[PDB]
Amino acid sequence: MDKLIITGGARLDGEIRISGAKNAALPILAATLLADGPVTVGNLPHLHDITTMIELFGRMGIEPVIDEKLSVEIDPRTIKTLVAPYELVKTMRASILVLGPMVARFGEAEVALPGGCAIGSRPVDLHIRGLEAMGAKIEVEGGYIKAKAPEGGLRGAHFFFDTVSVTGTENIMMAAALAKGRSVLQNAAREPEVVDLANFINAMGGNIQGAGTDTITIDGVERLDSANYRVMPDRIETGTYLVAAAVTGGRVKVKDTDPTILEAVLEKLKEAGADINTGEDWIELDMHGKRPKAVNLRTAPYPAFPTDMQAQFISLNAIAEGTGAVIETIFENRFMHVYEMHRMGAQIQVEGNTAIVTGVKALKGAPVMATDLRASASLVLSALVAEGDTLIDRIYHIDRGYECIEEKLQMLGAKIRRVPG
Amino acid sequence: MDKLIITGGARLDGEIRISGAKNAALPILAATLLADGPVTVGNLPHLHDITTMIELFGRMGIEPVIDEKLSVEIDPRTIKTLVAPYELVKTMRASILVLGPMVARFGEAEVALPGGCAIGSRPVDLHIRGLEAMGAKIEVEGGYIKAKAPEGGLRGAHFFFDTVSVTGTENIMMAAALAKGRSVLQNAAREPEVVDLANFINAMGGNIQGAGTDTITIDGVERLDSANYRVMPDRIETGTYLVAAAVTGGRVKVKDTDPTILEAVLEKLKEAGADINTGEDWIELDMHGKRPKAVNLRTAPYPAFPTDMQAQFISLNAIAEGTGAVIETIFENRFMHVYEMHRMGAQIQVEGNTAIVTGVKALKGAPVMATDLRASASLVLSALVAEGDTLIDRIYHIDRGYECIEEKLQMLGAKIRRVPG
Amino acid sequence: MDKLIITGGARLDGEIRISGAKNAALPILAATLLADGPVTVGNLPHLHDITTMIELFGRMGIEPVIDEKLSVEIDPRTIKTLVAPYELVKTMRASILVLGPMVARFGEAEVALPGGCAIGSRPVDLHIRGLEAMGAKIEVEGGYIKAKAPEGGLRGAHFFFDTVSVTGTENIMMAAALAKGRSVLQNAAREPEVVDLANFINAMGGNIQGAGTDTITIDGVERLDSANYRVMPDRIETGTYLVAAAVTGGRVKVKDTDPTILEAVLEKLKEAGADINTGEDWIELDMHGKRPKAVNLRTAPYPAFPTDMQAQFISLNAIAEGTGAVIETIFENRFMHVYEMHRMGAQIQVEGNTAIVTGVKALKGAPVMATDLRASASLVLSALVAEGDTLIDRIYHIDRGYECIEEKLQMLGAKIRRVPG
Amino acid sequence: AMDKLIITGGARLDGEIRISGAKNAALPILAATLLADGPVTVGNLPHLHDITTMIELFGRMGIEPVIDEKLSVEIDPRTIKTLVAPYELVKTMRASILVLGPMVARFGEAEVALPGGCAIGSRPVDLHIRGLEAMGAKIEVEGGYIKAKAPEGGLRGAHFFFDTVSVTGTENIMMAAALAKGRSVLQNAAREPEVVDLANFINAMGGNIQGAGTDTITIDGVERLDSANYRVMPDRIETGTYLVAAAVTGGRVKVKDTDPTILEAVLEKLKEAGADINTGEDWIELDMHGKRPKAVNLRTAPYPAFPTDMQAQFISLNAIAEGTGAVIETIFENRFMHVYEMHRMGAQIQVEGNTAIVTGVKALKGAPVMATDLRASASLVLSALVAEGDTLIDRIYHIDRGYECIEEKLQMLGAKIRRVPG
Ligand SMILES: C=C(O[C@H]1[C@H](O)[C@@H](CO)O[C@H](OP(=O)(O)OP(=O)(O)OC[C@H]2O[C@@H](n3ccc(=O)[nH]c3=O)[C@H](O)[C@@H]2O)[C@@H]1NC(C)=O)C(=O)O
Ligand SMILES: C=C(O[C@H]1[C@H](O)[C@@H](CO)O[C@H](OP(=O)(O)OP(=O)(O)OC[C@H]2O[C@@H](n3ccc(=O)[nH]c3=O)[C@H](O)[C@@H]2O)[C@@H]1NC(C)=O)C(=O)O
Ligand SMILES: C=C(O[C@H]1[C@H](O)[C@@H](CO)O[C@H](OP(=O)(O)OP(=O)(O)OC[C@H]2O[C@@H](n3ccc(=O)[nH]c3=O)[C@H](O)[C@@H]2O)[C@@H]1NC(C)=O)C(=O)O
Ligand SMILES: C=C(O[C@H]1[C@H](O)[C@@H](CO)O[C@H](OP(=O)(O)OP(=O)(O)OC[C@H]2O[C@@H](n3ccc(=O)[nH]c3=O)[C@H](O)[C@@H]2O)[C@@H]1NC(C)=O)C(=O)O
Numbered sequence A, B, C: 001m002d003k004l005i006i007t008g009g010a011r012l013d014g015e016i017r018i019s020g021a022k023n024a025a026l027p028i029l030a031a032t033l034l035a036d037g038p039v040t041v042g043n044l045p046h047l048h049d050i051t052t053m054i055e056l057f058g059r060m061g062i063e064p065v066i067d068e069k070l071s072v073e074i075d076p077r078t079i080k081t082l083v084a085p086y087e088l089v090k091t092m093r094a095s096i097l098v099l100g101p102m103v104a105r106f107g108e109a110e111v112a113l114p115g116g117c118a119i120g121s122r123p124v125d126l127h128i129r130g131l132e133a134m135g136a137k138i139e140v141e142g143g144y145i146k147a148k149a150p151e152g153g154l155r156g157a158h159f160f161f162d163t164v165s166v167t168g169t170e171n172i173m174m175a176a177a178l179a180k181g182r183s184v185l186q187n188a189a190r191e192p193e194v195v196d197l198a199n200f201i202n203a204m205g206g207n208i209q210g211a212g213t214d215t216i217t218i219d220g221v222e223r224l225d226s227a228n229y230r231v232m233p234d235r236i237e238t239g240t241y242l243v244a245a246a247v248t249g250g251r252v253k254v255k256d257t258d259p260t261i262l263e264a265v266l267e268k269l270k271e272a273g274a275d276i277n278t279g280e281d282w283i284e285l286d287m288h289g290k291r292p293k294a295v296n297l298r299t300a301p302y303p304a305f306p307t308d309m310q311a312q313f314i315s316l317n318a319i320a321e322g323t324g325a326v327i328e329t330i331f332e333n334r335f336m337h338v339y340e341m342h343r344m345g346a347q348i349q350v351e352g353n354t355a356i357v358t359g360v361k362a363l364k365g366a367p368v369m370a371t372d373l374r375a376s377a378s379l380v381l382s383a384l385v386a387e388g389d390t391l392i393d394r395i396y397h398i399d400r401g402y403e404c405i406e407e408k409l410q411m412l413g414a415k416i417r418r419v420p421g
Numbered sequence D: 001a002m003d004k005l006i007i008t009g010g011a012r013l014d015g016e017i018r019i020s021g022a023k024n025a026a027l028p029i030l031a032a033t034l035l036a037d038g039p040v041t042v043g044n045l046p047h048l049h050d051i052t053t054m055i056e057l058f059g060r061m062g063i064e065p066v067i068d069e070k071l072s073v074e075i076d077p078r079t080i081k082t083l084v085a086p087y088e089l090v091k092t093m094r095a096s097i098l099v100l101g102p103m104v105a106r107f108g109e110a111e112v113a114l115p116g117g118c119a120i121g122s123r124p125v126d127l128h129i130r131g132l133e134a135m136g137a138k139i140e141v142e143g144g145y146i147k148a149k150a151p152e153g154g155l156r157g158a159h160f161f162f163d164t165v166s167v168t169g170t171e172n173i174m175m176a177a178a179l180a181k182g183r184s185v186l187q188n189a190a191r192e193p194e195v196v197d198l199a200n201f202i203n204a205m206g207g208n209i210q211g212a213g214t215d216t217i218t219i220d221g222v223e224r225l226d227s228a229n230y231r232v233m234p235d236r237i238e239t240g241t242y243l244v245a246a247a248v249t250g251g252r253v254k255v256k257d258t259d260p261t262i263l264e265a266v267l268e269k270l271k272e273a274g275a276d277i278n279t280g281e282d283w284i285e286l287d288m289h290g291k292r293p294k295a296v297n298l299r300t301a302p303y304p305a306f307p308t309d310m311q312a313q314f315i316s317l318n319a320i321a322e323g324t325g326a327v328i329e330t331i332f333e334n335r336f337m338h339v340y341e342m343h344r345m346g347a348q349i350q351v352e353g354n355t356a357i358v359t360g361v362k363a364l365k366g367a368p369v370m371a372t373d374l375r376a377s378a379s380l381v382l383s384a385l386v387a388e389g390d391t392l393i394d395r396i397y398h399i400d401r402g403y404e405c406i407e408e409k410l411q412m413l414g415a416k417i418r419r420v421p422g
């Protein structure tokens, strides 16, 4: 119903505060189930995926308490139904993150098996085999992953991920924290959300070492004592606002972030002709009104260029000077945004997993449709440098991946407004 | 929005009547814009894409005279607004078919540039380039393809398609019908709907030779007179009901159709172990209660295996004996239905354009979700064999590509029912 | 140990005669095995693959009249051995073309199963299956395809090609020419050499209709009598010399050719900036000293852009102005020539089946290596516009696909010389 | 003209063999001797043609090595004359590009022939150049040579980020940074074991390399690197090949002088195939107990994921396994030459893009085949052990480049293989 009308031309200039990592808050909220008492999770971003995670906890019997804005107190001792119903899992496949801790703490779980997702192929085979490696008897029946740990809880084991998985590493890490004995995860996801999740379990009395590297070692404990924690900054949001400034040729000082969690993104911004300055908890980018130069990029697991920034750089190459090759290795058909940009005058040829972008002088305003919680931000970025008005429909997707995108751009001098239907 | 509830286990047996081709009716209806008098189009299918095309004519000032048993009289001389609004084109990209004949008959047209489509990469550069080859000056602005022909009208020319395009051939074919001089379409699409359009334009007075081969030659004319013309049978609908019998191990006679327009589909049904007989206007498949045998297939332009039948054969391979390799060369990442079938207990490994389907003995009923007008029929087909109830949501997609799917399956003895919201 | 030493910088200018189609001569020669009397093939190109095909006839016991250069007389009635040995088949996989006619004419054959080729995936499964569909029992043993036709010869049948195959269509076409009754080749290869093969078999008394279209209906005959037929002109050779003049900015009049067998290639040369003029059997190209413009291309089955010209246009894009996207669909990783051009200063990024060629002002001479009988001609072309000398090694590959390439370039004024050792 | 291999299948393997030094570690370690200014001794070198080729490259530069003791080659780069890696040797081995980094950092300049094409797939070297340019070295590709020239005062350290994981790419910049003034930080670096072994070799010569093994390597430059005796690590690819050799035949084998931690992905896939495996400080013991292997799915990727050098070997395993398995290549998407040679031996393998859908059969049939890949062609030797009758493999000069006398080791396990010079 809600829409965003954006008038291009405006040069961005200002500073905004970054929200907590969406992909760190979800696994940490799921990790609260491992605790044996009330746990307060701070620096949460005000976006819909956090709200869907709160509903899920409601459906299970847990009643979250908001002591302050961007903060939730979770008490897992009031849990009644060990079920992640399909009515909610169908809306957010990240709900599967509850499977691991729920099985390792309470002994069983019935999580709905995720269906299809527009982005591409996103099976959860590794999530299931990882829990089986720890003795759990799992079966897919009636659309649910009916898991049940063996008597005496889960057992520690050496499990190898054939493919690097972020949420896969997270489920098995959480389960390994309460399993009996030592668990060793091989070819683990090295994303900072994983590290931030480990630091949460360790704060609670967990024995996790290796997070950040390909080999995570977990020494099981019988019970994780409650302890408060503040979620890390969102590396994707941070990057998205740096590109917003870059695309428009203006400047921005992104605050409350971390420069060490997006080296690849900052390095691509320098190749495009941007000047970057950084502090301990802030980043400052300034193009000085220069038309960027096309850059090539290849998505891959962290610390490589993240796929959640792939779309954002296509909107940069769209008005750049020269040809840029934006390649996908994670999700090879994540280019819906490209076909919407065609309407705005962007010249891009997509062949398989590669998007060849030919930079034109400027874009043209046209009504577009959002369809990806992170990639559709590129439509918001392209609209900022498009002659005329750009009406972006189906923004509920954008609301899932970004905290008040309209308000943050308005502080940077952007001419953008929300239009409720 | 409505839903479809299906109880599997029943072995289908009966006979139905095939409707008019959706992909033939769409260009044939668009082709009525070329007429210089009232034209009647028969055997139209009762599905939503046709309803959207009628609305498109409504926007342009034409008020199609619908009648009982699906017949539409169109007098294009009452046209008023030479525009195909984005509000209608965003719901169906096949609306671009009006560009060609509208530029050739009236000298100008403003048709919204199609946006993104979940299926995959579907650009329209060849549509635009083909009209540019005939002297028309085109420019993309405000999200619209603003086409203008010269004073004398469109001039015939030799145009070569770099990629085989069904709707591309149709647009350029229709434009060349009123153009001055001969036009030769090289590397043209050979689909039977292209031939059916050619024969429709010939009934109106046109002179189109070669339709159905790699080269189409058009000797342009001044005007096109009235004509009454029934469209061809739908080959995808025909193939879909043949699989419905094959998955359930039953029989089905398909009336009012044509066996010559789907030799590839019938051949893959022989490999699966199906007994097939054909007549002048009918096809009869009968599995004799046998479990299907796995089959490997590869989608390609007609007469190769059609991409619109790719999903239906995955349903067939899901309960087949052995492993089957289902490959896509047209829409490489068109496998959303595979992840929905995972919920029903199917075992399919998807890697890029290949779907390795490992057949199991039985599927399990569970709530699924449709997303593709033709491919989502596979979910209905998988539900016919699965154990228990299968609740299919978002059936408006199915209602676009198939004429009352529940009423036809009901004649074959299937437990299927429409449940409104 | 032969090598070509080219000195770049010369602007080509002249005219040359095109040889007979190499890929038409091979199957037409193989078709002579079907005959029941002396058959003479004319207009043969003097290249190694024809020599290798003649050695095979020698090993089979046939003593062909090799008096004349451009023609050969063959009497299959004097055959002594129904075998295509591994010693020869390993050097040329096109040797499999003798399988079909040998099985149909002599009731059995044992042809070595081709091994790997550095180009890409080239299995011969459609060849084996097509013969099996005609009632022939076939097994693979000792690295040989041992086929055996039933008593009364092969039976005609409807056979569907899952993938468009040139040599596949040619084998089943030849076998069906002597089979009992009608045969229907569904989704046949439309390449001009298949048409040239059909007309040859028809000249011997056969009845092959639909050659050049997607469906070929062959009515088998009992005996194929003598005929004196001249093969068609080589379309790939034509295109290579047209590019030779296009890269050097010169001109060239190609004689004894046909413009209708390479419309896709002629169209891409116009998009590059070359002025083309044609006739019944000639094609004249002239760049008039202009630097070409970058062009995109997609290889596919004829009449689409041929894969045997994909490398030739990569050298053209190297010297071109702008970025050119060269895409492969037949052999998705046939880019060895690209990595050889990096040595000559060419800026080409390769990702899967797509080559992003970024044009530069000039190439630098350096010793390179040939690996493909058709694509390595691009190394010879790049050397024409490279500064200094370019020493090409392993030219035996080029001698297979081109009739004394240096002598024809000498006619056009190119500084090219052959030096053994 | 050249050697061949004749293999008679059916024999169940049983025995033990000693693993040689890592080819891909011995190659960069030898090139790293150029950084030193003294008599550096390198032990445990494998006897394979590529080590001989690297020695020839040193000879053309004026550095003839002296063998101190068995398998211990002592190199002293102070006697170097010419700073050029000729095309005549680089065209035969593209790994020769590894001398560029150290030759530029120590001596100031270098001319290394730009490698051409490799049948395996797309293997450009743009990151090797981009990394040296990030350290101030001006480079140009003229006459087919990478004419690199460092600025006065040596190379300057820099924070270079690899857009794609490159093993040899990570090694060249690591060696260059070893002597470059200032700190160098390689981001998204290759995590392969040979990178770690190389880092420990440079540290043994007085270097300062941290984070080798992890995706972030920090290097601190020094004035010079003194002499030190060092032994190269075991070859993980050789280890895996012989573990499959025992597995395809339903037999067993103990692998000595190796390391299980350097091929976890390989050992897990063998357990999924139904192989009983035991490990220790420096050995691996596998035994199929005569059971037919189970079909397994694979996905090649940068270490520690399943290595692409082991992809071909597991196809020969699936070729005779129970069920259908998918072998996927993310690195070299068209590295399947061996598959078409396996078809000749009776294997059922459908290739589409980078996926090899292997459907297993009771057994293979012997047939003459041809090798064309220094590592992947070992699969032809493996599939020949389970092929009825004789199998004549040709162009084995490729196999000699990546394996130390493959016939004498299979003969130690009881395999009916023999080398035929005819
Ligand atoms: C799109 C989002 O961000 C995504 C982000 O794009 C991806 C990749 O960086 O990693 C997270 O997803 P994820 O954990 O489901 O994805 P991953 O598991 O890393 O998948 C990577 C690759 O591994 C494959 N994969 C994954 C899991 C599995 O069991 N098997 C498997 O084969 C997938 O096919 C995919 O191609 C983020 N989501 C969360 C909740 O952490 C989002 O916020 O929803
Ligand atoms: C999905 C539908 O059916 C589809 C059917 O799947 C396909 C393939 O057979 O051909 C029709 O689409 P279409 O005309 O857009 O498809 P094609 O034009 O043949 O596209 C084939 C390929 O060519 C490429 N392509 C197409 C047009 C173009 O200008 N440029 C281009 O590069 C596309 O990327 C695609 O990969 C049907 N639609 C209609 C209205 O005729 C539907 O009912 O909407
Ligand atoms: C390389 C040469 O030219 C080639 C030329 O590149 C191609 C494409 O037009 O068609 C001929 O090969 P071919 O007939 O072996 O190749 P095709 O059969 O067309 O193969 C096309 C595609 O179909 C697939 N294919 C073909 C046959 C088969 O049984 N199975 C199969 O999967 C292949 O994987 C390939 O990707 C020419 N050769 C001859 C002797 O006619 C040469 O000079 O030998
Ligand atoms: C085949 C051999 O082993 C190979 C082994 O297969 C590969 C992969 O693990 O890593 C080494 O090659 P390499 O270092 O040249 O390969 P990598 O640099 O890792 O290349 C991996 C991928 O990165 C890409 N790549 C690499 C470098 C570069 O500058 N740009 C680039 O795009 C390539 O296209 C390739 O697809 C081994 N060789 C040596 C001497 O260390 C051999 O012994 O020759």
Ligand SMILES: *[C@](C)(OP(=O)(O)O)C(=O)O
Binding pocket: A089, A090, A091, A092, A093, A094, A116, A117, A118, A119, A372, A373
């Ligand atoms: C993808 C984004 O999955 P999700 O919505 O997060 O469950 C989708 O549905 O498109």
Ligand SMILES: *[C@](C)(OP(=O)(O)O)C(=O)O
Binding pocket: B090, B091, B092, B093, B094, B116, B117, B118, B119, B372, B373
């Ligand atoms: C695809 C299915 O195209 P269309 O609806 O026909 O415009 C989509 O939009 O998802």
Ligand SMILES: *[C@](C)(OP(=O)(O)O)C(=O)O
Binding pocket: C090, C091, C092, C093, C094, C116, C117, C118, C119, C371, C372, C373
């Ligand atoms: C390719 C070109 O196949 P062929 O020689 O024609 O059998 C090769 O072997 O390199």
Ligand SMILES: *[C@](C)(OP(=O)(O)O)C(=O)O
Binding pocket: D090, D091, D092, D093, D094, D095, D117, D118, D119, D120, D373, D374
């Ligand atoms: C590959 C293997 O590279 P190299 O020979 O090692 O330079 C090849 O040439 O095929």
Ligand SMILES: [Cl-]
Binding pocket: B119, B120, B121, B330, B331, B332, B333
């Ligand atoms: Cl697609």
Ligand SMILES: [Cl-]
Binding pocket: A186, A187, A215, D261, D264, D265, D304
């Ligand atoms: Cl590991």
Ligand SMILES: [Mg+2]
Binding pocket: A090, A091, A092, A117
């Ligand atoms: Mg969703």
Ligand SMILES: [Mg+2]
Binding pocket: B090, B091, B092, B117
């Ligand atoms: Mg739609």
Ligand SMILES: [Mg+2]
Binding pocket: C090, C091, C092, C117
């Ligand atoms: Mg060859």
Ligand SMILES: [Mg+2]
Binding pocket: D091, D092, D093, D118
């Ligand atoms: Mg080589």
